[PDB]
């Protein structure tokens, strides 16, 4: 037997009100807020990569080796 | 046996009100907010990549190796 | 036996009100909001890629290796 | 037997109100806020990588070796 | 038997109100706030990497050797 | 006098505003005004006797949520001789 | 007098504003005004006797949440002779 | 007099503002005004007797949350002869 | 007189502001105004007798949270002859 | 007179401000104004007798949290003849 990332809840009663709940979060992006007010941005690009926005990436994988969740704003010239 | 990312809930009663609930979240992007007010953006691009918007990516995979969830704003010139 | 990303809920009673619920979320994008007010955008592009909008991608796959969920705003010139 | 990252809760009563709950968070990005007001940004790029935005990456993997969660703003010229 | 990162809670009563809860956090980034007001940034880049934004990365892995959670703003020219 | 000009350009934007007043805006926000959440009551053997003569009585398990803009919110009001001239 | 100019450019933006007043804005925020959360009561054998004559009485398990803008929020008010001229 | 100019450039921005007044803004924030959270009461054998004549009485398990802007928030008010001229 | 200029550049920004007044802003902050949290009461055998004549009485387990801007917050007020001219 | 200039540059920023007044800002901060936290009371056999005539009485387990801006916060006020001219 093997348990990994398991949320367990048990409750027992005879008379009254009983509440049982279980929650699980794996690879979750929650609550991203961005505000830009009266912002000046001047970009001159020649063959490059420029990133100025908002990026939110959430990845969950099982039995995955070598995976990349995010790769933002890069120049790759492998030979 | 093997349990991975399992949410379990059990409840028992005789008289009254009983509530049982279970929730699971895997690779979930939740709550992304962006505001731009009176923002000036001037972009000149010659053969490059420029990203200024909002990107939200959520990926869930099983038995997947080498997967890329997001690749935003890049220049690739592999030989 | 093998359990992965399983939400389980069980309830038992004799008299009264009983509520049982189970929810599962895998590769889900939820709640993306964007506002642009009085925003000036000037873009000059010559052979490149420019992205300024809103992108929301959700991907769920099983037994998929090398999959890419999102690839936004890139220049590819592989040889 | 083996337990890893397991949240367990148990409750028992006879009469009254009983509440049982369990929560689990693995690889979760929560609560990212950014504000830019009256900000001036001038960028000149020639074959490089410039990143000025907001990046939020959350990755959860099982049996994954060599995985990279985030790789932002880099130049790679491997031979 | 082996327990690692396990949150356990148990409660027992006869009459009254009983509350049982368990929480677990592994590889979680919480509460990142950044404010830039009237900030001037001038960047000239020629073949390099410049990073000025906000980066929040959270990674949780099991049986993963050699994994890199974040690699921001670097130049790699391995031979 | 407010003047905005743009001459001899390739892409030009010229905006002029005399007076401007911004407003209220919500983006991905949650609000709760006058909200009752999660009330649980258990009673086994309760004896209640009420003798009310010309008054307001509130008895039992009561869960009241009120949201008022230009009025009054009351639960029990035993008044008299209310006049507006 | 407010003047903004931009001449002999490739990309030019010229904005002029006389008077500006910003507003209220919420981005990914949560608010709670007058919220009752998580009330649990257990009673076994309670005896209650109420004799009310011309008054306001609040009895029992009471959970009240009120949110008022331009009015008064009251639970029990036994008044008299309320006039507005 | 407020003047902003930009001449002989490739990318040029010129903004001029006479008077500016910023506003209130919330980004990823939580607020709690008048919030009652986590009230638990256990009673076994309680005897209550109330004899009210022309007054306001609050009895029992009471959980009140109030949020008022331009008014008064009261729980028990036994007044009289309220007039506005 | 406020003047801002930028001439003979490749990337140029020129902003001029006469008068500026910043505002209030919250970023990733939490606020608690008038909050009651975590109240637990246990009573076994309590005897209560109340005889109220023309007054305000608050009895029992009471949890009150109030947040007022331009008004008064009271729990028990037994007044009389309230007038505004 | 406030003048800012930038001439013969590659990247140039010129900002001029006559009068500036900063505001209040919170970044990752927590505030608690009028907060009651963690009140536990245990009573076994308590006898209470109250005889109130034209007054304000507060009795029992009381947990009150108040936050007021432009008003008064009172718990028990037995006054009379309140007038404003
Ligand atoms: C709630 C309650 C119960 C029992 C005793 C009382 C005093 C109250 N309070 C109020 O009625 C508050 N009020 N008063 C007035 C003015 C008015 C009232 C009665 C007769 C003539 C004029 C009013 C007018 C227009 C729209 C709303 C309202 C309002 O809401
Ligand atoms: C809540 C309550 C219960 C019992 C006893 C009292 C005194 C109160 N308090 C109030 O009624 C407060 N109030 N007063 C007025 C003015 C007014 C009241 C009555 C008659 C004529 C004029 C009012 C007018 C318009 C909209 C709201 C309101 C308001 O809310
Ligand atoms: C809550 C309560 C219970 C019992 C006894 C009292 C004194 C109070 N307090 C108040 O009514 C406070 N108040 N007063 C006034 C003015 C006014 C009141 C009554 C009659 C005529 C005018 C008012 C007007 C408009 C909107 C709100 C309000 C308000 O809220
Ligand atoms: C809470 C309470 C209970 C019992 C006894 C008292 C004195 C109080 N206190 C107050 O009513 C405070 N107050 N007063 C006034 C002015 C006013 C009051 C009554 C009649 C005519 C005018 C008022 C006007 C407009 C909006 C709010 C308010 C307010 O809040
Ligand atoms: C809380 C309380 C209980 C019982 C006895 C008293 C004296 C108090 N204190 C106050 O009412 C304080 N107060 N006074 C006034 C002025 C005023 C009051 C009554 C009648 C006419 C005018 C007021 C006006 C507008 C908004 C708020 C308020 C306020 O809050």
Swiss-Prot record, chains A, B, C, D, E:
Disease listed for this protein: Genetic alterations of SNCA resulting in aberrant polymerization into fibrils, are associated with several neurodegenerative diseases (synucleinopathies). SNCA fibrillar aggregates represent the major non A-beta component of Alzheimer disease amyloid plaque, and a major component of Lewy body inclusions. They are also found within Lewy body (LB)-like intraneuronal inclusions, glial inclusions and axonal spheroids in neurodegeneration with brain iron accumulation type 1. Parkinson disease 1, autosomal dominant: A complex neurodegenerative disorder characterized by bradykinesia, resting tremor, muscular rigidity and postural instability. Additional features are characteristic postural abnormalities, dysautonomia, dystonic cramps, and dementia. The pathology of Parkinson disease involves the loss of dopaminergic neurons in the substantia nigra and the presence of Lewy bodies (intraneuronal accumulations of aggregated proteins), in surviving neurons in various areas of the brain.
Main location: cytoplasm
Protein modification: Phosphorylated, predominantly on serine residues. Phosphorylation by CK1 appears to occur on residues distinct from the residue phosphorylated by other kinases. Hallmark lesions of neurodegenerative synucleinopathies contain alpha-synuclein that is modified by nitration of tyrosine residues and possibly by dityrosine cross-linking to generated stable oligomers.
Gene Ontology CC entries for this record: actin cytoskeleton; axon; axon terminus; cell cortex; cytoplasm; cytosol; extracellular region; extracellular space
Protein name as catalogued: Alpha-synuclein
Organism: Homo sapiens
Outcome recorded upon mutating residue 19 to F: No effect on osmotic stress-induced phosphorylation
Subcellular location: Cytoplasm; Membrane; Nucleus; Synapse
Positions contributing to Cu cation binding: 30
Organs and tissues of expression: Highly expressed in presynaptic terminals in the central nervous system. Expressed principally in brain.
Location of region: 4 X 11 AA tandem repeats of [EGS]-K-T-K-[EQ]-[GQ]-V-X(4): 1-47
Residues of the full protein shown: 21 to 99 of 140
């Amino acid at each position: 037997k093997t348990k990994q990332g398991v949320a367990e809840a048990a409750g027992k009663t005879k008379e009254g009100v009983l509440y049982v709940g279980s929650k699980t979060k794996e690879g979750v992006v929650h609550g991203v807020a961005t505000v830009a007010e009266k912002t000046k941005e001047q970009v001159t690009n020649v063959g490059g990569a420029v990133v100025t926005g908002v990026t939110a990436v959430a990845q969950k994988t099982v039995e995955g080796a070598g995976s990349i969740a995010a790769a933002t704003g890069f120049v790759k010239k492998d030979q």
